[PDB]
Write a protein that binds this ligand. Sequence first.
Ligand SMILES: [Cl-]
Ligand SMILES: [Cl-]
Lengths: 357, 357
Amino acid sequence: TAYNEEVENYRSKVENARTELSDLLEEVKATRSKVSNQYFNSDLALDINSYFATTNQEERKLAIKIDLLNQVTDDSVKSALANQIQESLGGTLPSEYETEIASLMGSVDVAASDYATLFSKLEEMGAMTSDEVSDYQSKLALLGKYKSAKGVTTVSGATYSFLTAEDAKPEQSNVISVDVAPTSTKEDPTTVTISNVSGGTVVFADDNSVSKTISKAQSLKISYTFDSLSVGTHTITLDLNIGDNRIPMTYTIYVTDTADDVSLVKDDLKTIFAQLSKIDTASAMIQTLYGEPGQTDLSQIDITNPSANSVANMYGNLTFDNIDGLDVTNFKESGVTLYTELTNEIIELQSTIDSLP
Amino acid sequence: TAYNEEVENYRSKVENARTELSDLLEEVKATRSKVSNQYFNSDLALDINSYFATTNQEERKLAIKIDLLNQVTDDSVKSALANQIQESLGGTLPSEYETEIASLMGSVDVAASDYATLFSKLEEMGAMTSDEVSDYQSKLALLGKYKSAKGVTTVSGATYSFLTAEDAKPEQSNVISVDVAPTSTKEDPTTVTISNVSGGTVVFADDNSVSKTISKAQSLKISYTFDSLSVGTHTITLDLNIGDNRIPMTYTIYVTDTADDVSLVKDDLKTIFAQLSKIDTASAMIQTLYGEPGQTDLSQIDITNPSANSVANMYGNLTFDNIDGLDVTNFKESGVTLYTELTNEIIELQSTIDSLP
Ligand SMILES: [Cl-]
Ligand SMILES: [Cl-]
């Protein structure tokens, strides 16, 4: 007729629309799952049943949002945001820093023991304090850690003139010869003597005597000996008496103590300045790249495994933790809005599927 | 009857379902827009009409994906990913670096001009090369830039003993007195002379003469004068002749040149080492934090506006550009999948709405 002749097609199409919507529903459930994995790091699969009875749509969205915020932790969102920048996290220290350090170290000797004698002389002469020697030994220890951690070629050995510089050594004894003659064949005996000696011993060489008597022209040898060869100026003074003649005489020697001082300044100092400068520069570079910020105890600085806050580890490095909290909040808010609207849409799609005869 | 008595409710419900789905459609369009803004940085609003005729569903998704990939640039996705970590980008250099530098600089004098005299003396004595003086002036210039950029209190002034150290100056002339007596009232005249002089001038004080004749016991004054006061040992030798007596005589003076050398080593060197060490350490720290990696021309290092690759600018700093390309690709892939599935769902929802009598 008309109720079963062509009307059955009407109901069959309605039922075909009902089955189409049931398939669309599952597709919407699957994309809601992918949204949950992106933003929340898991698949919450929020159960729509709890909100299905609420007819007010904004009242329904509010209820869904409140349930999601009490169910998703900020940590989960932080992990989900990190997953979106998995490769970008972490930095790379440019290799030019190590290249410059190795250049400096190429002409430096890092074996601190080889400095003992040098540091000992400089400390005996008052030219370097004990703390300066302690610090250079710490910096040298650090350069060793770096050289051993990387593959740094360095130099080995050095000689310093001023470590073997010797002052002249003047002769402590000496001898002289004088020509004496008697005072006029009545050439009577004439007594020659050595009087008023100071600064040493002055005596005639053959007798060890200080008084002689002659009666003919003659030569006499006099031995004089300074009292010591200690540092400073030494002077002998005496009177040589020939008859009524008194001739004052004096001899001087200078024991200097400035050989090492003079050699240090003119031979070695310029080389010592350069080497200490290289040690200071390279050690400070290493300290600044591999030390915890503000670290002054160089023994604590680790090279092979840099510390968390070191420049070597933080250069161009966004860490999981330093991901700002506001970004996690806004990321959480984006996911909740998307998830809420998709859940609300599933509810409406189920409602129309249900309410469809 | 039955076709218009209760059947009209059937068609009205079908039409009410049709209007519900038309409202759901717009809600789906709005969330698809929010998905496009998150991942693509704009609202593409892809037009479904082009794919509406394709019945194969996977063939439809493929066509949509291919259209989206030829429409979204990787740069747009990069900007969208950056927007998700807007606050996390950028680092903060810990303040401990500046704190350590300022501590070092607190006992350093950064005015390089105040070093001129010191550097000039050290260079005259061969104790420092000309390049060492040029480098310390560069490092001092850099410490000035840092002190002026930050607010670093420093020290001003210093005195060095060895810059005014003077050697003793011995007397170039001197006089002596001898007691002469004639050789025996037949006390005949006796001639006293000065012979075989070298090293200076030796003459009797009153006559400027070298020969005298006496006839009675007497005192004579002799003036001797070294030839110069130049550096080194000077010795005068002569023979004093009294009758047939010949008494050799000698005098010596020592002009030393080691006053500044001795003072540098024992007074000032230890202070100079410490100050040069502080200059080297702090300058190297500054160089390593504010220089482009591997920069050795210290004049080019800018403090107030660090350079892009400086440690000061790259510490804990993920830049927009260093966002890895793979992350942008995977982010683009997530958005395209979500957008594709939402577009495909809109097509199916419109299809069932259309095919619904
Ligand atoms: Cl450390
Ligand atoms: Cl630079």
